[PDB]
């Protein structure tokens, strides 16, 4: 209630200050990640009729998630929210999916930076996870990748590829493609990457950025497999 009453209508200074209060106070709570997923689902829904500055409060959400990344519940609850969100790819909410995949992408880049201080995905910025739910959300992300048509766009494709590679490399052990895709799905991905049914002319599938992101995701999952 304090988050929904202060960060929505308050000034940016008191918004940032009360977010800092919430992470320095209830950052280590066991329900913090569930609260973050709940406020994400109840603020950025496609049916949400509230007029609020989504971008700045999303930046605040990214800041407080990067603060609470020491807690292990935020990433688990956000990936569970993803798993619930693209469940119809076993309707689809493309904007909310985009919001949450960029949020978890920022959190996973902070995780990668922490692991570095204690590179293939640097063209965007200029902990231990359970195996089964990670496998489920990864294969659902791949099925979202394969079901991308003219309604879906290329930046979302880049970000789902990036977060797919990051979740595949973050889980212990690293998820391999055998439990990710079967033969038709991998054949569709390969023919989408190199076949001339989608790579004809200067408007090859998703553009060169999407081709590079797909290649980098496959290379990252392969390198995680052969470690």
């Amino acid at each position: 209630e304090l988050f929904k009453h202060l960060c929505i209508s308050g000034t940016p200074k008191i918004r940032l200050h009360t977010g800092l209060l919430l992470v320095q106070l209830c950052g280590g709570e066991r329900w913090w990640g569930q609260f973050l997923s709940n406020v994400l689902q109840e603020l950025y829904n496609s049916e949400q009729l509230l007029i609020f500055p989504q971008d700045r409060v999303f930046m605040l959400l990214s800041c407080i998630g990067q603060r609470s990344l020491s807690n292990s519940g935020v990433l688990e609850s956000l990936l569970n929210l993803l798993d619930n969100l693209l469940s119809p790819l076993q309707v689809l909410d493309i904007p909310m999916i985009s919001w949450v995949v960029m949020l978890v992408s920022r959190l996973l880049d902070y995780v990668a930076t922490v692991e570095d201080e204690a590179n293939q995905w640097s063209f965007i910025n200029n902990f231990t996870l359970a195996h089964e739910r990670c496998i489920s959300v990864v294969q659902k992300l791949v099925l979202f990748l394969l079901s991308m048509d003219f309604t879906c766009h290329a930046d979302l494709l880049l970000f789902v590829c990036k977060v797919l590679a990051r979740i595949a490399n973050a889980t212990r052990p690293t998820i391999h493609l055998c439990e990710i895709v079967n033969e038709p799905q991998l054949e569709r991905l390969l023919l989408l990457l190199v076949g001339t049914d989608f790579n004809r002319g200067d408007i090859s599938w998703g553009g060169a950025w999407a081709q590079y992101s797909l290649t980098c995701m496959l290379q990252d999952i392969l390198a995680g497999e052969l470690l």
Partner: protein
Amino acid sequence: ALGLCNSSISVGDGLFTILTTLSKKASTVHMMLQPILTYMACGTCQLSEPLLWFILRVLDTSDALKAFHDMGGVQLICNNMVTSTRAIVNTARSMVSTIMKFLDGIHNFAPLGTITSSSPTAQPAEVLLQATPPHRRARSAAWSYIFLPEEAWCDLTIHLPAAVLLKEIHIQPHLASLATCPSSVSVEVSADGVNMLPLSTPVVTSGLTYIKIQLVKAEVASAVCLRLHRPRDASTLGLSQIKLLGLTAFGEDQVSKTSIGWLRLLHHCLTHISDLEGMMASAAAPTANLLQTCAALLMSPYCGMHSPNIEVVLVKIGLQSTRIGLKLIDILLRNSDSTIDILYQLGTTQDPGTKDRIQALLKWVSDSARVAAMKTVEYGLLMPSPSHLHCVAAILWHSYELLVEYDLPALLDQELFELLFNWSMSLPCNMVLKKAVDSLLCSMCHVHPNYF
């Protein structure tokens, strides 16, 4: 060859002229339309702007459209458009690029990266990486390289901090003394930054004051290796500034090769001659997933240049028959200004299928009022667009004003009025949903004064 040539003395102009004269000098239009449709079927298919113009020009006459429909042309157009909409994902900048662009027009990337060479030079080449060094006198050179007699190539490897969409290389030699300009330059790109891979054959730049290596295909590259050859009669290399032009991930011909070309083909088929627009639309109707793909492409931002064609062909397909119009009404209300125009032109145009269309509109608004009364396919009933409700009100008003064949007040029911009244008082006055349902109530009371 015409399918892969860009739009605006050129080879595409030549092919367009030979195809124009080949259409003019052809005797029967059937034997000219046959290779066109076999190309469309055998292609998915490659369809460019000059090819689109050539097909529109050969489909200028009424006999051309009749022969095109007779041997199965419209169905191939619809199937190709559906398959292309299913095939290529949208490359347009969505909301993600907008809300990540500020969190961190071709821009330079040389100052951001670093430079190195495989041989120990007398000076480092980082002076080449400046955005604009002072080029007014050019005393000796900005950077110089001394060549050993055994070697002939020297490589300048430029490592960028992140991979960029490289588009064109700029190499400026010593302008005061271009005797030291490289004879030939071979570019190399690396997306991962480690695997050097040659670009093209080395272009000869001897005697060139400025080297511009454009790429027809923009390449995602993080490292660029410029291998410069020894000059023709100089043992030294002199360079001034190297630029690395391109874009980042979030920093005419791009829409013609998509599904928009087949949609333009359908729009020209259904709108060039109105005498043939009905029966040919009867061929365009029963193709699978046409209306869903058309609405999905209409919801895309890339529709913003050709949106009148899309909405007009949707109107013609809707008023072709009753079932198709009812289905597209269902997918537009349950599953923007263009949709408002679609609903308006469906509801107020008079045909034998008008009564079923307004019945579907009233059933939709009654279902939305019911869902709002108790509180996948029901999402359009969870909240309706207020603009759609205002459009339904305008449809009912203009149907009451115009002379219609049906008994319009027979469709209006008192229970529907009670449902919309409870929906109106179920929510406060801040939102426009109240204004929409109240405009609908106003149209209801205008048709029925006894209801007021």
